Amino acid sequence: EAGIVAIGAEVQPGDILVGKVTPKGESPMTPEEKLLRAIFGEKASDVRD
Amino acid sequence: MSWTDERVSTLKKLWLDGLSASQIAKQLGGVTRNAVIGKVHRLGLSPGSATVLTLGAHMCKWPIGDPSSEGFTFCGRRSSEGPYCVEHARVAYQPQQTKKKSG
Amino acid sequence: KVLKIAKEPISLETPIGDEEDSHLGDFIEDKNAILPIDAAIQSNLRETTTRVLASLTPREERVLRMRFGIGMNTDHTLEEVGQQFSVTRERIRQIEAKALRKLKHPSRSRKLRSFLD
Amino acid sequence: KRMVEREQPQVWDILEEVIREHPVLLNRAPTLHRLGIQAFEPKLIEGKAI
Amino acid sequence: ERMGHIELASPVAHIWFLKSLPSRIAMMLDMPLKDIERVLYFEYYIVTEP
Amino acid sequence: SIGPYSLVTQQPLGGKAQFGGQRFGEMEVWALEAYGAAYTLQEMLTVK
Amino acid sequence: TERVIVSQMHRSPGVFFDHDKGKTHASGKLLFAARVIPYRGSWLDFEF
DNA sequence: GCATCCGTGAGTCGAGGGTAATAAGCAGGGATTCGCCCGGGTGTCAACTCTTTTTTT
DNA sequence: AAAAAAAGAGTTGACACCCGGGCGAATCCCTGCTATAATGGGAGCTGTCACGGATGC
Lengths: 49, 103, 117, 50, 50, 48, 48
Ligand SMILES: [Zn+2]
Description:
Chain A is α+β, with helices and mostly antiparallel strands and 49 residues long.
């Protein structure tokens, strides 16, 4: 729950070892992506992976 | 204080004609010092033998007396290749020049 | 806030390796650059958006392309599109909602769902 | 792009079909003569050694 | 693709056309390279229009 | 296949640390010039 | 990460008498140069 | 016509990964910058009227 | 054989709100002024040649 993999956990190439999110500033988006987001109703997150 | 149409006009006029910015708020009344600065920033538009006159080239220039006194003149003698005279060149500059360093 | 000032930034020519070669300028990534795989995904999305906008009526498609700048460089607000359209302010939202509901069907928005994921 | 990431078993058949006659260039580090760069026909094989 | 220029209060001599192997400035008007370095360093005074 | 590019040169980075690219050395360009290949060396230095 | 320090090997700070084997000269001859290379200081030479 | 002194060169691909030191003080006046708040243009909804394609008679 | 309405349009008021532009206030940057006597500076090669050229009498 803290974001770190448990000791003795099998991991594969390209796996999330430590989940860290950083605050991302507001950036302009293409109109097609905005239309798709409005169609699906999901809200764009303000944090970056 | 107030910010009517006449308040901005008189403020701009008093800032343009010239006056201390600190007294600008007091003359207008009510407005403080910080308000007028913000308004102007937001709105924009923010004995010898020669006197001191008969001193020619190649002459002594060692002063004698007090310049703020009645009689103040210079020597005015044969003192070419030097500002001061030979009689004062040894008393003005550092006598017995002995200095050296590395280079 | 006084601490963490980042004074005296490291020179980009400092040799990272023990030898003279392999400077610090090589071990640096460019963040502003966009990868070609990302740009290729944008073309696919721009083309699929035109194909999906073929079953709707001309009025709803026109109002959607006017409010959302799909083929237009400048965006248009609700009042701006209403001044040019018959419906002044109110029914434009209803037309947009109807067009959005028409696109929410899985049969019509099956290929378009993979972009969001 | 998501199908090849998870490495589905169906992608192997597409890889063998695409790599049929596409020649790849192989060259050693000290390329002294022009023979150091020679093209070949790649063939899928296990392991990590060319 | 945008460049900027810096204004100089006094003229300066190019280093490439001065300290290169063949003295380009010295080749003009038959001037030795040893004399040009003295004038640039403000050591001596050159006379013109006699 | 496609990785992060350089900062000032706008070229693919080097080294196996973060998606390096095999450097096409100067001697390798002479090999293509020896052969009659002119389009393989033209696209391998500009569009890649 | 532990880091060890390897020993360094350099010339001894003493006087030497090295003469070139007939090189860097117009005709065949020897120079017989002598050095007074100290540990920390300016070097000295008495080349012929 | 020779003797003495100052520039260029040194293969090529690969590994390896981050760095580091000095340190006056306070008084005057302006330009800058962060909090609150009224506000007018943008959205999101109750709720009153023509048209018409049938579905019922 | 006839004949009117849930939607489909079309609006009409009724909030909810969301950055913008001012009003403040709180606080940064610049600049100058300090009164015993201060009076020329610290690395750096020097364990490659060889060529090819630039100065001098
Ligand atoms: Zn005198």
